[PDB]
């Protein structure tokens, strides 16, 4: 029923379809509400980008909480579980993936948003006792590394969706491509 969730869902769809340029008028209309109502929730496109990114990240991380087992010590096994979690989430919720990938490479996420993103799920930190995933790049390239992860993830989802009889095969082959590209031992 509640208007914030309706606006966040409408913003998810609109950005998934149109990118960050998506219109607040269209988003407000697709929700129940007047555009003025939308502005009381997010006064700027910049704040909507930041709010929606944290919303989508929270949703993903909660799905990962449901799926992840902590008897796992092996970094590669833990990374595979994370990858499987992300692919499932984007196959279940294609617009949430499409939206988050455009928000992630928008140049509009604030340092406050990054810290709230890094903080929100302590349970998902570390899960490596020191880390393997994308720690080899300079800080300037962390967004680029995230973009490559998302590109490999999106291609894996596309083939698994089109050819579901081999979905697990695409997910495993995509994981090993991601692992080689974005880790070092």
> Which residues bind to its own copies, rule: CB under 8 A?
105, 107, 137, 140-141, 143-144, 147-148, 150-152, 154-155, 158-159, 162, 166, 169-170, 173-174, 177-178, 180-182
86 binds, among its own copies, ligand CHD, none (CB under 5 to 8 A by kind): ligand CHD
Residue closer to its own copies (CB basis): 126 or 169: 169
Residue closer to ligand CHD (CB basis): 10 or 109: 109
What is the SS3 assignment for 108?
A: coil
Q: Nearest to residue 154, comparing CAs of 102, 81, 80, 78?
A: 102
Rounded to an integer, what distance in angstroms lies between the CA atom of residue 137 and that of residue 72?
26
Give the tokens for residue 22: 């998506």
Q: Contacts with ligand CHD in 115-144 (CB under 6 A)? A: 124, 133
Residue 149 as a binder of ligand CHD (CB under 6 A): the answer is yes
Residue closer to its own copies (CB basis): 18 or 37: 18
Q: Nearest to residue 14, comparing CAs of 5, 27, 32, 1?
A: 27
CB 100 within 8 A of CB 113: no
């Amino acid at each position: 029923e509640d208007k914030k969730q309706a606006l966040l869902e409408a913003a998810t769809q609109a950005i998934a379809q149109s990118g960050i340029a998506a219109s607040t008028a269209v988003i407000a209309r697709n929700a129940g509400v007047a555009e003025g109502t939308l502005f009381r929730y997010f006064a700027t496109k910049d704040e909507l980008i930041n709010t929606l990114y944290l919303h989508l990240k929270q949703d993903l991380c909660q799905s990962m909480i449901m799926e992840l087992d902590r008897s796992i010590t092996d970094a590669k096994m833990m990374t595979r579980f994370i990858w499987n979690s992300y692919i499932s989430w984007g196959l279940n919720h294609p617009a949430r993936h499409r939206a988050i990938r455009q928000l992630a490479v928008s140049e509009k996420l604030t340092k406050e948003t990054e810290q709230r993103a890094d903080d929100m799920f302590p349970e998902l930190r570390d899960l490596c006792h020191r880390s393997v995933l994308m720690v080899f790049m300079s800080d300037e390239y962390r967004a680029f590394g995230d973009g490559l992860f998302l590109a490999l993830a999106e291609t894996t989802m596309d083939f698994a969706a089109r050819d579901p009889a081999r979905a697990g095969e695409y997910i495993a082959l995509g994981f090993e491509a991601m692992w080689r590209a974005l880790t070092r031992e």
